[PDB]
Structure formats: C-alpha cells, structure tokens
Design a protein around this ligand. Structure first.
Ligand SMILES: O=C1C[C@@H]2OCC=C3CN4CC[C@]56c7ccccc7N1[C@H]5[C@H]2[C@H]3C[C@H]46
Ligand SMILES: O=C1C[C@@H]2OCC=C3CN4CC[C@]56c7ccccc7N1[C@H]5[C@H]2[C@H]3C[C@H]46
Ligand SMILES: O=C1C[C@@H]2OCC=C3CN4CC[C@]56c7ccccc7N1[C@H]5[C@H]2[C@H]3C[C@H]46
Ligand SMILES: O=C1C[C@@H]2OCC=C3CN4CC[C@]56c7ccccc7N1[C@H]5[C@H]2[C@H]3C[C@H]46
Ligand SMILES: O=C1C[C@@H]2OCC=C3CN4CC[C@]56c7ccccc7N1[C@H]5[C@H]2[C@H]3C[C@H]46
Ligand SMILES: *[C@@H]1O[C@H](CO)[C@@H](O)[C@H](O)[C@H]1NC(C)=O
Ligand SMILES: *[C@@H]1O[C@H](CO)[C@@H](O)[C@H](O)[C@H]1NC(C)=O
Lengths: 205, 211, 205, 205, 210
C-alpha cells in the first residue's frame, strides 16, 4: 500500500505528463487483436459490428523506476487517464466506438505499458455473400490519428489474429483473420502513416 | 453530523487513495448476484439483456477506525468515487453496461466495504430453444479486468443466485441460476485469472409445465 | 444580487457538504408524484415508459439562515449539485432514467428543500389486458438505494397521485393512480427498507 | 486580443457568478423561436420531433462595462458555461433535448446577453389529421423550471414565429406558428408561472 | 521530451487563452472536406447520414515560437481542448454530430493550426430520386455559429471535395461533390455570415451507368 502510493505520486503528481512522441524521440506501439464476436451485419447500410480486445504496448523512459527504491514493486495497475496513451483509431468506423471494459493500464518497472480495452466497433463492410460457402471478406485499418510514421510506428507480434476467445455460438464463423502492418500515403498529408490492417473473412454459420 | 464529517475527512482528505492490491498484498472480493429480470432476447444477434444487482465485498486495513474515537459510529455510506472499487467486468458483453442505480458504498469500522450496484447487461447467448419446456442455458463470467489471481481472488458466499426479487411477470422464467468460482488461463496472458461464472437456465413464460 | 451571493458563499463554500443522514441523525423525505404521460408499452419485453415529476422534500439544519442577516431573502434556487440530495431510486427500472429538466432545487430559510425533476422511466410491467375495459395495473417502488429505515424514512402528503397535468391525448388513460408508503425486508439485508409504491391502473383510450 | 482578455478577466475571474434573480431583483427574459423543421411524427406514441433555434435575451448590471476603458469593445462572444443562463424548459417533452449547436452567448457593453442554441425536441402531440388539408395543431409551453413570475418574467418581441429558415423540402409544411406569453397557476405550487406557448399548425406535403 | 514540455508550458500555462477573433483582429479559417461514406438515407424523415473528415486551418500570432529557442522543434500535437478552435457548425443538422476520432490539433512554429476531426452528421435532405440514374443532389452549409463575416471569414483551397478515401462499396456512389464559399444575410441578424456550402450529388449503387 504505502510503497505503491509513493511510486504513483512520484511519477504522476510530481512531474509533467509525457507530451507524446516526436521526430527526435519516436515511439513504437505494438498491436494485437483478440476477436470475440461478429455480432451483426446491416446489409441496408453496409455496416458490421465487431467485439474485440485491442492489446496495445509501448515503453516510456519517463515511467521507469528501480524496484528496490519502492518496496520491491515490479508493476502496477492504473487508470488510463493517469498516463499518455496512443491515439490509435479505426479508419472506417461509422459510429463512435463503444468501450466495454474499464480503461486501466499495466505499467512495469522498465517503463513498459500494456493497455487492452474491449470495444464494439461498427465499420464499413459490404456483407453481400456472407450467406455463401466462400463467405465475405472485410477489412479495417487501425493507426494513429495525428502521428505519422516519423513519430509513431506500429508492429504486430504475429500476423495471426487470436480467435481463441471467439464466441463459439456466434451467428458468424471466422474463416480467416489477419493483422498486417502497412505504410500509406494519402492526398491530404505529405508524410507517411502507419496502420495495422485487420482483415476478417467470415460467413453465416 | 459533526463526528461523521471528521471521520470522512480523516480517511479521504488526509491520506492518499488505496492504489489497489499487489502480489505482496493481495485482496479477496466476494461476489453475489441478485437476478431481477431477463428483459429480452435477440435471436438474430444472440444477445440477451439481464437486469441484476451485483453485490461486491472486500476489506481494507486503510479504512479501519475505532468507533469510540468518532461518536460511536460503526459504519457509513459514501459515493463510490471516494474509494477504490474493484474492476469486476463481464467477459462476454456486447454493449457497455448500463448503471441503473446510484453508485454508493457502505464502509464498516473493521474496513469492510459492501457495494451493490444495479446493472443492465447485454451479453453473448444463443437463445435457441427458449420457447421449449426444457428452456435454454446461458452463461457469463465476471472477473477483474487487469488483476490476475495473484492480486485479486474471488469467492461467493453461496452457489445459488438469489431469485427472490425476480420479476414474476417477466417474459422469461428462471429454471435455475448458479454462480461458481473458476480459475482460467488464456492465450493472451501468462498468469491465471479468476472469475465467477453466472449460469442461468431460462425459458419463455408458460401457464403449466408437463404432466 | 449582493446579499444572495453572500448567503450562498456562507452556506456552500465556507462549511463542508452534509454527509447524509445516520442512525443518530435520521431524515424524512416526502415524495409526491405528478404523472404526465404513459408514452408507450412494449409487450415483447414487458417494459412501460412513464413521464412524471417526482417532488422530493426534506429539511436540513445546516441549510438554515436568518432572513434579516441577508437582505430579507426567504428562499433561493440553486443547482442540485451544490447540495446533498437523497438517493431515491426506482426498484424495477430496465433503463437508466432520462432527466427531462434542469436539476435545480429551491432552498428555504428554515432549511427546507424542494426538488422536483421531470423524468422518463422504463420499468417492469406486463401490459397484457391494456386494450380491455378493465385495463391493467402496474406498480413501481421508489426508495433510498443505500439508506435503511433507520437513516431515511419516506412519507407522502397524500395517497392520490396528481393527474392534473396528465396529457389529455395520451394513447393511455389513467383509471387510478396511488402512492403508498411501505416497509420491506429483503433476504440480502438485515435492516428494513422504506419505499413509496406507485400503483397505476390504465388502459388504451 | 489584449483588451478583450482583460475585460473577460475583470468580469468572470474577479467577481462571483450571478446567483440568479430574486423577488427583490427580478429579471425579464425575451424569447423568440425560429422553426427549422418538423422532422417526424410518431402516431403510435403521440410524439413529434422539432428542430428550432430558441433565441433568449436578458440583461444583467453585473455584465456592464464602459467601451472606452477596454479598447472600444462594444460586445464579445463567450462560452455559455462562463455565465448564468436561464432555465427555460419545454413543459411537455418526452426525451431529453438534443443540442445541435455550440453553446456560445453574445454579451454587449450595456449588460445584454443574446443566446440562441439550436435544439431537437420530442414533445407530446397527437398527429391524427396531419395528412388532411385542415392539418393538425400542436402546442408546447416554454418557461422557467424553478423561477415563478415574481422572479422571472417572459416576453416575446413578436407573436409570429420566424419561419424564414424553415426547411422547404420538409415532409411537413407549416400553416401557422405563433408564440404567446401566458400566466398560469398549477395545483403543485402557490405562486404563478409564466410561459411562452408555441402553437404550430402543420400538415403533410 | 524536455524541450517540447517547456514549449507547451510557455504557451498554454504562462499566458491566457486566445479569446477569439474580433472586428479589429479578424481571422480566416480554411475548410476542406474529405468525404468517406454516405451511410444511409431516411426517406420517411428526409435525413441523410454522412461520414467525413473536416479539415480546419487558421493562424494565431499568440502560438508563434522560434524553433532555435526550443530544441529545433518546428511543430507539435496537442489536445484540441488546450487551444481555441473555431465554432464551425452545419446549418441544417437534425442530430448532434458524432465525433469518430480523437480531437487533436497540430500546431506549427509560425502559429498555424491544422485540426481535422472525423464526424458523422445527419442533415436535412430529400432523397427522392436517389434510386435513379440521375441521382439526387443535397447540400449543407458550414459556418461559424456566432462570428459574422467581420470576425471570421472562410475560404477553401479548392472547389473539389476530396473523394479519394470514399468507401468503394458504400450503398451510395458519389457523382459529384463541391465546396463553395458563400456570403449570406438572414432575417435574424444585421451583419453578414460566411459559410462553405457542401453540395453532393449521389445515387444508389448500380453496377452499370446505362
Ligand atoms: O482523408 C483522410 C483519410 C486518411 O485516413 C487514414 C488515417 C490517417 C491519419 N490522420 C487522420 C486524419 C487524416 C487526415 C488529415 C487531414 C485531412 C484528411 C485526413 N484523412 C486522414 C488520413 C490519414 C492522415 C490523417
Ligand atoms: O482475449 C481476452 C479474453 C479474456 O477474457 C477474460 C478476462 C480477462 C481479464 N483481462 C481483460 C482483458 C484480457 C486480455 C488482455 C490482453 C489480450 C486479450 C485479453 N482478453 C482478456 C482475457 C482475460 C485477461 C485480460
Ligand atoms: O436484491 C435487491 C432487491 C431490493 O430492491 C429494493 C431496494 C432496496 C434498496 N437497496 C438497493 C440495493 C439492495 C440490495 C443490496 C444488496 C444486495 C441486493 C440488493 N437488492 C436491493 C434491495 C433493497 C435493499 C438494497
Ligand atoms: O406538476 C408540475 C407541472 C407544471 O408544469 C409546467 C411548468 C412548471 C414550472 N415548474 C417545473 C416543475 C413544476 C413543479 C414543481 C413541483 C411539483 C410539480 C411541478 N410541475 C411543474 C409545473 C410548473 C411549476 C414547476
Ligand atoms: O434563426 C437562425 C437561422 C440562421 O441559420 C443559419 C446559420 C446562422 C449562423 N448563426 C447561428 C445562429 C443564428 C442565429 C442567431 C440568433 C437568432 C437566430 C439565429 N439563426 C441562425 C442563423 C444564422 C445566423 C446565426
Ligand atoms: C524487499 O525484499 C527483501 C528481500 O529480498 C526484504 O527483506 C524486504 O522486506 C523488501 N524491502 C522493502 C523495502 O520492502
Ligand atoms: C534544425 O537544425 C538546424 C541547426 O542545427 C536549424 O538551422 C534548422 O533550421 C532546423 N530545422 C530544420 C527543419 O532543418
């Protein structure tokens, strides 16, 4: 109790918040999707609803501490509002994302943060052919809203999306689910943007 | 008035908030479900909506006081925002939980906290067979979102879910309702996670069973 | 202006907020319902939607003042967030209550508070028979969420619910509407809880 | 920039917020409705949805300044949260009002405030006959929620509702739209309440 | 880290917030629409739902800094709540705008701000004829809610709306999309108001142009 209280107070109250990465001090965020359910499909609007956990990881020097100075504490939990979090956003949503979990991150003594919120997302997807054997493929890109590749880079720890919690009696079964880093240029903006492309092939069960 | 004001000021203003449990100082939270209503079932999405009270209990040394130092006060009520609460979450929801009550906890002189909010949850459930006599079974796990078994443990005071306030004219009648501690390992994470599994067998309301 | 500003500053800024009632210093809240409209009925879910004003009254010593010390001011209006309010809750709602009005209370020199928000409530009710001549009866209990009878007691000023603002072209007409204090014990909890039971008999017009 | 910053700091930071009108220092609020669209009608619930601007005006001595002391500034814009606003509310709503605009007021050197938010309101209205040539009439009262006629009075600058922005391809055309001050006594309350009654006659196109 | 922290503290904590433009010190905001999807059309209410990015740009002297005084930093990102933003609003919405993105702006050393939120808007539009080959045209004006032309002026960098991110399998295909500055007088108000008029011609997705 006493040690952890002091640690948190030293980090968050006594110094200013991390102001985000820069070209001089860029940052790599690791992303992993754990798909839980394709809830529904709206063929009149081409919107599809997913439930998933999005695991995000990154490391800041300003969150480091020596465990021996603070009661042998190696890690702690804290409200995501107490720390900088990356502005990772789906690029083809049609509604604001619904958060289905507390927003709490895990900070380790080496400055590592793991943050893994559950979300329901409605996104752009034509479900024509979902009732077939072939199924249908849809995709959604996730990346930083304001940070280019020179400030935020993304990687995945694997190309395969974790389907081990996928709801077995979902109305839709997953044929394939991948997550793949991409570099992209858009007419809006001079500098390149990095995303992870979630590609899901699925059909009616 | 005067004594309780001082007690609250001593606890909440004069010291920092409890920063949650750790591997060295873990915590056991007790859970009890009081099921009120199965409001609806959506067979086109396999989502079902429950209304229930979730009673949570735990005990902190940092919330202890001697009643004789504070006007013989044994317990008080306070906004849940004034204290640490455990991050107990349903593991198969499809919408954000709707809170149907004030969020106020009861703190006792021994450091016990009881906190019992009402909620409406939509969760993953195939209702195929609900219109039968047999009914249908669905389940939802409740556990800490970020704390493993080494920091937060769960127990129940009984396997039986309290159905004594269940809405008698619900469209769905409850056949059985249990709540059972489980230990689980997931591919995401090295350390084990504890949940309480709410298992509810229910069917569309009938006038008469079988002969 | 000048007097009222001082009064409010003396009460709310210069002393702590009232921490709620206790067994030693319990409190009585008076409830009165003014039913405006039964908007709809959902027979597929047994939910019914009411619009109503819930008048709440109570009296605190910590809100008293002498009018002669403050420009002859006998009462004032203020945001409900500036004061303690009782945690009166419907016991069989199925959605969070929608507030249809500002949340402003009236405080009188004797420490009386009147607080009278407009609300839309969805609650548990089987409407089977609403299309009949007999109609249908439904009920909903209102009481403190955390305070037992030893801390908060409830009374009504009358058994009859005020229907004088009821929408004349509602789809549902009210046959009867009562509000009745009750004492209750529940298996969860050792001490007794007080509620006011709103009982409404109504039918299609 | 420099002058306006000082003016705002003099008014809002250096003195307390206006605590609302009283019997000794009452206030007149002027109301004007600018009707934009009748979006829809629900005949199964007798609810109708309007989009409109509600222009509110009032004058406080505590917001006066001499332009010559502050760079010749005659008026400025500011967030409505920085000032007291009146609690004018529709008396027969069935959902919370949706705000469709920024909430920003205009303050003039004489202490005048103009505040003119856009809103979507669902309110109690039987649309039976809207498909006829005669059309249908509906009405909704707007008034202070907590201030009686002794504290807040209302007036209009005209009996005619401004239809000059009304959506020309609305599903419903407006036949007539008036706004009329009323004095009212209710069974709840001893003192009189003032409202402006918005009366709209409309039909299908 | 250290330099940027100081820069932000110098600008936002040590001086007061910009109180908005005036007749003496007016401001020009540049607008650019990037249309993503026409999600749906409701012919029973004449409401249509768009998803789009609205790029807003303006320049304040009070946000200038010399890069050489602050570790060679030419620009930074920050929460839109930390700065003044213009009150640009759709003039014929029927619901509150849904924000589909973080609200973060980019500030440059010359005092330039770029702010580009994603939004879903429901607005007044009669879709009669959307199922035809000709399609249907709808329009919505965007302008300052409280600032007249004497305080806020608007311009576009181009008349053409960017459709390069438009969802290719939308239920509705875009035939044309323009954005055009206008000056307007209204019966409410003596002084003129500036808007940019977003005009979109669209139809139900076909599979052939006939
Ligand atoms: O037009 C676009 C689409 C594109 O979407 C992928 C993600 C991106 C990251 N941010 C989010 C806003 C955006 C941008 C800025 C200014 C105008 C339009 C615009 N967007 C996105 C764009 C990239 C780059 C940038
Ligand atoms: O994929 C999962 C499923 C599983 O759900 C039961 C509850 C858990 C408690 N927390 C909440 C998020 C979660 C987690 C972290 C990182 C990636 C995926 C992931 N989840 C849940 C998981 C456990 C562990 C952990
Ligand atoms: O199980 C219940 C039902 C009952 O509902 C009527 C109102 C009450 C006032 N508060 C609200 C929460 C409640 C309570 C506490 C702990 C477990 C279950 C539980 N509830 C309600 C109960 C009473 C008492 C208490
Ligand atoms: O019962 C009512 C209906 C009536 O509605 C018109 C507007 C009014 C202004 N305020 C809003 C709340 C109200 C009031 C106070 C206490 C109990 C009931 C009650 N209301 C409204 C009433 C008036 C007076 C008062
Ligand atoms: O009544 C109106 C309609 C008109 O709508 C187009 C947009 C405008 C920009 N602002 C937003 C509010 C408004 C205004 C001010 C005071 C009373 C009514 C009123 N409005 C809009 C008006 C213009 C001008 C002004
Ligand atoms: C840390 O652990 C050591 C043994 O490794 C133990 O003796 C000590 O109590 C702990 N130190 C602190 C400061 O808690
Ligand atoms: C960065 O560094 C040099 C000096 O080392 C400076 O003169 C230059 O203008 C800076 N910025 C850019 C964009 O090169």
């Amino acid at each position: 109790q006493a040690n952890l209280m002091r640690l948190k107070s030293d980090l968050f109250n006594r110094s200013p918040m991390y102001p985000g990465p820069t070209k001089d001090d860029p940052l790599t965020v690791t992303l992993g999707f754990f798909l839980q359910d394709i809830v529904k499909v709206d063929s009149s609007t081409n919107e599809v609803d997913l439930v998933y956990y999005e695991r995000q990881r990154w490391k800041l020097n300003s969150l480091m501490w020596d465990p021996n100075e603070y009661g042998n504490i190696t890690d702690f939990r804290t409200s995501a509002a107490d720390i900088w979090t990356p502005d990772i956003t789906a690029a083809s949503s049609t509604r604001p994302v619904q958060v289905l979990s507390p927003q709490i991150a895990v900070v380790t003594h080496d400055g590592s943060v793991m943050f893994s919120p559950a979300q329901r997302l409605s996104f752009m997807c034509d479900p024509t052919g979902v009732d077939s054997e072939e199924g249908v493929t849809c995709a959604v890109k996730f990346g930083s809203f304001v940070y280019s590749g020179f400030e935020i880079d993304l990687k995945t720890d694997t190309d395969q999306v974790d389907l081990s919690s996928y709801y077995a009696s979902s109305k839709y079964e997953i044929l394939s689910a991948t997550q793949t880093r991409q570099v992209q240029h858009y007419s809006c903006c001079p500098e390149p943007y990095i995303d992870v492309n979630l590609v899901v092939k699925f059909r009616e069960r």
